[PDB]
């Protein structure tokens, strides 16, 4: 729900969900959003759909379709470099949807922004050196950069205070035309407990297991941490409730 | 402070290439028709590398501007002669801030055959 | 592209009079998004004003800069000889930039 609240964005500006401990639907998501582009990496789509793990991480922001190939980590293209970078050691799921008309309440920023390029001056008058996006982090350069890049072409330079480094830092802004449908980017990064996994698919018990329809016959039963093998009769209410 | 320079008048022939060089932030260029309000070009950043044209010169102006080089140049092909005017070349603030604190002392190009 | 009106242009103005520039204009544009620009005959324009507000470093005080939103108006305190020459609004809040068609002052003493 806060996914879907508000405007998703742009890809540098990503906002950042995180699940520690609750049960995830897959299905529930991708019935949201209509799902163009699918792809994973160090593991398969399809396991992601129904696997526990540790934690899930969730990055939320609008991406078009046309530049999907610039925003990957084996390519070496500026979008990916200067804007979102998702870390390889852990699983990670790349998923392109485009906003279904029938889906309300998502709001659309004016045009899909991306930061151009990211650089700090390691000497004012003559030396520049291009500063790379650590993994995630929200873009260093992010501070410079307006959420939504005003111009195509953007000049934007701010100074370090020295000492330091008292170097100039300098962003630029590039902006792409907007689809008629929205179409957003999410990234996610889960990653493994060794022995523990608190978030897993839903749901834990299933609703076909259940005491009621198995009265009269001898069931194995775990309810609350109490494992035996029974036969269960409904009766009248007996004991403090 | 940058001291901003500008390459000598050259008479060019219509359809040739002017390289007006302005020698040593980011770099904007300026026309201005004689007796006529002053017209922006590009503005092109050395230390970006980024290049911004005006719709009504685009794709005819190339113009590049190198860190290394510390010296800006802007290339006219197939001008027409309508096109002669005086050229200047304005250091820029930003995107934030466009303004131009220095200009260049300028270079008159004229055009006829 | 905003189109922006300018003051008629040649003025005869006495030295010690206040003298004040119109630059309305038709596009709705950044309340405090506008540059003067004073150039000498035969010389290139320096920036006075930046922004509607404040004076550029190394520019006299006497050149102000007021109004906003439509029209912007510059208003000299003193009037000097050497404060003859064409001046020009340039709007940067709508891109591409457009120049004033600039006013032209003339002191006579």
């Known amino acids: 729900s806060p996914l879907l609240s508000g405007t998703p964005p742009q890809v540098y500006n990503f906002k950042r969900l995180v699940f520690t401990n609750c049960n995830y639907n897959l299905t529930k998501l991708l019935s949201l959003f209509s799902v163009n582009d699918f792809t994973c990496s160090q593991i398969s789509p399809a396991a992601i759909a129904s696997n526990c793990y540790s934690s899930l991480i969730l990055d939320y922001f609008s991406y078009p379709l046309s530049m999907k190939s610039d925003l990957s980590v084996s390519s070496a293209g500026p979008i990916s470099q200067f804007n979102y970078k998702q870390s390889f050691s852990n699983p990670t799921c790349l998923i392109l949807a485009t906003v279904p008309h029938n889906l309300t309440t998502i709001t659309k920023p004016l045009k899909y922004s991306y930061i151009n390029k990211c650089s700090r001056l390691l000497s004012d008058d003559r030396t520049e050196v291009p500063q790379l996006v650590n993994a995630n982090q929200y873009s260093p350069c992010v501070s410079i950069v307006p959420s939504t890049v005003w111009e195509d072409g953007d000049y934007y330079r701010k100074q370090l205070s020295p000492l330091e480094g008292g170097g100039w830092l300098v962003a630029s802004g590039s902006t792409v035309a907007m689809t008629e449908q929205l179409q957003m980017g999410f990234g996610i990064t889960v990653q493994y407990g060794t022995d523990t996994n608190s978030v897993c698919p839903k749901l834990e018990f299933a609703n076909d297991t259940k005491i009621a329809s198995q009265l009269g016959n001898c069931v194995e039963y775990s309810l609350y941490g109490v494992s035996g093998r029974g036969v269960f009769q409904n009766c009248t209410a007996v004991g403090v409730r | 402070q940058v001291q901003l320079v500008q390459s000598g008048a050259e008479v060019k022939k219509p359809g040739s290439s002017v390289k007006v060089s302005c020698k040593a932030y980011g770099i904007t260029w300026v026309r201005q028709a004689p007796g006529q309000g002053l017209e922006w070009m590009g503005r092109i950043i050395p230390i970006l590398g980024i290049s911004r044209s005006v719709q009504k010169f685009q794709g005819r102006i190339t113009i590049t501007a190198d860190k290394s080089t510390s010296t800006a140049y802007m290339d006219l092909s197939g001008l027409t002669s309508d096109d002669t005017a005086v050229y200047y070349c304005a250091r820029e603030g930003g995107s934030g801030y466009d303004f131009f604190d220095y200009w260049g002392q300028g270079t008159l190009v004229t055009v006829s055959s | 592209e905003i189109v922006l009106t300018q003051s008629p242009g040649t003025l005869s103005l006495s030295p010690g009079e206040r003298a004040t520039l119109s630059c309305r204009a038709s596009q709705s544009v950044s309340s405090s998004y506008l540059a003067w620009y004073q150039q000498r005959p035969g010389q290139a324009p320096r920036l006075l004003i930046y922004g509607a507000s404040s004076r550029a470093t190394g520019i006299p005080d006497r050149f102000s800069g007021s109004g906003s939103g439509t029209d912007f108006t510059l208003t000299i305190g003193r009037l000097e000889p050497e404060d003859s020459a064409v001046y020009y609004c340039?709007?940067?809040?709508?891109?591409?930039?457009?120049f004033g068609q600039g006013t032209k002052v003339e002191i006579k003493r």
């Open positions: 340039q709007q940067y809040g709508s891109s591409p930039w457009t």
